[PDB]
């Protein structure tokens, strides 16, 4: 079945948070707000992706 959609910016942030602590902060790869690259907390993006993976169910057969 289909994968629950995940935006490209969230995929990017998720990859950037690979092997990071949930408290670590990384730069966005795509978002600029108020003249600064947005900073993303790895805990938030990981939660966001995991909840898409939960919604995917058996569609996600494994991987990062």
């Amino acid at each position: 079945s289909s994968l629950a959609p995940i935006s490209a910016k969230d995929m990017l942030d998720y990859l950037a948070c690979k092997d990071k602590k949930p408290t670590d902060v990384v730069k966005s790869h795509t978002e600029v707000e108020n003249g600064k690259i947005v900073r993303v907390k790895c805990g938030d993006i990981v939660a966001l992706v995991q909840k898409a993976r939960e919604q995917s169910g058996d569609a996600w057969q494994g991987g990062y």
Partner: protein, 504 residues
């Protein structure tokens, strides 16, 4: 057994690879190959379109009938003699091809780099014997006009008006069962984890199916435009698009130019990106130093090849080469296809990334290759993010009904197409304000510029994802989308002010 054919194919054909004869394998392959349920024939929209004259060469199994003239009953050498006048270059090219020089192949010595061809000839003969087209002690004397165009190893006369055929993939596969089965195995090895693309696609095995199952292709009235599409989509039907008739030279098919007529252009500029990359520029500079006649397996050793080429990268899989080009596919050209980006981190994609790392590390260190492929993946997602932001704006206009002409001049596309927003049909058919400009612009941002951005990244052409293709053009589409969006908001604010004034 054909060791290079995946197990998935013997499973799908309900064959035991340890026991199936060549004849059994061929017959099972061809039954599927010719079954409308598996993509043969006119497809699900055959009622919406009819062949034009050239279609008899594009899909001969459905459409080819021999010519009503000449009324000739010809033997094998009659073909050659008459066509020495009617199609003289075909005869000249055929005469100097391997097909017409099989005794040369038989007499190759084990120290010749082309010696593998003798084994292939002997396998062909074994195939034909299993099929009962060739005696157990009979050598294949040649592959001549009558063989491909009438019947393999035909000994008697042919009626030109009844018996001529255009040789399709199953014709070649009568002899070249291995290559035909490797090709057909793409049906079985290209299964996306989440059905991102239909099973066995994208692939050469199903390129014609993919073509005729495209709604606007069936639906548009401009048949000669649509057949342009078909000319890029005939690998399924005939085997002469990389190694062309009538020379059928494997050396030709190994050259990047063989892929370029099809794998080029505004929505997949592989030829342009590849040839501009250092890889392709080196291939251009060094082409006359390489022995293109050695098989792909020997290209980098015996062949002297020191830069990668389309065929070497895409037919390589786990250190071997087969006609199946699907087994390392991860992005499949269009990054925005639902589920493709999300699947890029899966175990399925990582394992194909591992296979790609094996290809690149014929030359580069794994560390180098992996660092670039990481750039490819993330660069593609960066492009996709830019598109997704622009699409959200225009799609919201669609859902709000504020696209130009959306409610006044948006005629429905031709049957059996269904109306919608930013659909492929709008690239090949337009009427009134279907599509709107912003809609076409954001569709082309994905179909053309994001796709070409990804191709440039995959094929290491820096300009092809930054200034010249990809980022730059996507930047412009984004800018004009935001610009028109602001102008449309400003105009509707002005209209509202007028509407308020009319309320007195």
């Amino acid at each position: 057994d054909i060791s290079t054919v995946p197990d998935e194919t013997y499973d799908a054909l309900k064959l035991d690879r340890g026991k199936a004869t060549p004849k059994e394998t061929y017959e099972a392959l061809v039954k599927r190959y010719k079954d409308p349920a598996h993509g043969a024939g006119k497809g699900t929209m055959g009622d919406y379109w009819e062949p034009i004259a050239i279609s008899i060469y594009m899909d001969p199994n459905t459409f080819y009938k021999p010519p009503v003239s000449p009324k000739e009953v010809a033997e094998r050498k009659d073909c050659v003699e008459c066509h020495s006048d009617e199609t003289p270059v075909w005869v000249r090219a055929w005469k100097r091809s391997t097909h017409a020089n099989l005794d040369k192949i038989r007499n190759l010595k084990s120290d010749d780099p082309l010696y593998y061809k003798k084994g292939k000839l002997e396998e062909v003969e074994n195939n034909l014997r299993s099929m009962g087209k060739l005696g157990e002690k009979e050598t294949l004397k040649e592959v001549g006009c009558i063989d491909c165009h009438v019947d393999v190893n035909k000994k008697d006369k042919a009626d030109h008006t009844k018996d001529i055929r255009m040789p399709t993939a199953d014709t070649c596969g009568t002899c070249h069962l291995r290559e035909f089965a490797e090709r057909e195995s793409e049906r079985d090895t290209m299964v996306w984890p989440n059905g991102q693309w239909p099973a066995g696609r994208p692939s050469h095995a199903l390129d014609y199916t993919a073509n005729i199952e495209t709604t606007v292709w069936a639906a548009m009235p401009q048949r000669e435009v649509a057949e342009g599409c078909t000319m890029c989509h005939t690998n399924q039907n005939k085997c002469d698009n990389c190694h062309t008739r009538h020379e059928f030279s494997a050396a030709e098919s190994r050259k990047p130019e063989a892929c370029a007529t099809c794998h080029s252009g505004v929505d997949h500029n592989n030829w342009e990106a590849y040839t501009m990359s250092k890889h392709g520029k080196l291939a251009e500079m060094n082409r006359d130093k390489w022995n293109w006649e050695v098989r792909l397996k020997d290209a980098f050793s015996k062949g002297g090849q020191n830069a990668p080429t389309c065929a070497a990268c895409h037919m390589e899989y786990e250190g071997e080469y087969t006609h199946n080009i699907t087994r390392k596919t991860r992005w499949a050209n269009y990054p925005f296809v639902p589920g493709i980006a999300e699947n890029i981190t899966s175990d399925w994609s990582e394992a194909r990334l591992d296979s790609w790392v094996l290809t690149c590390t014929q030359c580069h260190s794994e560390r180098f290759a992996r660092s670039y492929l990481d750039l490819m993946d993330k660069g593609t997602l960066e492009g996709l993010a830019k598109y997704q932001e622009a699409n959200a704006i225009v799609h919201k206009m669609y859902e709000d009904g504020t696209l130009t002409g959306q409610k006044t001049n948006r005629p429905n596309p031709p049957e059996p197409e269904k109306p919608g927003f930013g659909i492929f049909t709008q690239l090949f058919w337009s009427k009134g304000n279907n599509p709107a400009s912003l809609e076409l612009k954001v569709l082309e941002m994905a179909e053309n510029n994001l796709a070409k951005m990804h191709v440039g990244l995959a094929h290491v052409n820096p300009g092809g994802w930054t200034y010249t293709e990809g980022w730059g053009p996507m930047n412009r589409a984004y800018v004009e989308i935001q610009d028109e969006y602001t102008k449309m908001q400003e105009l509707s604010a002005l209209q509202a002010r007028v509407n308020k004034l009319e309320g007195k």
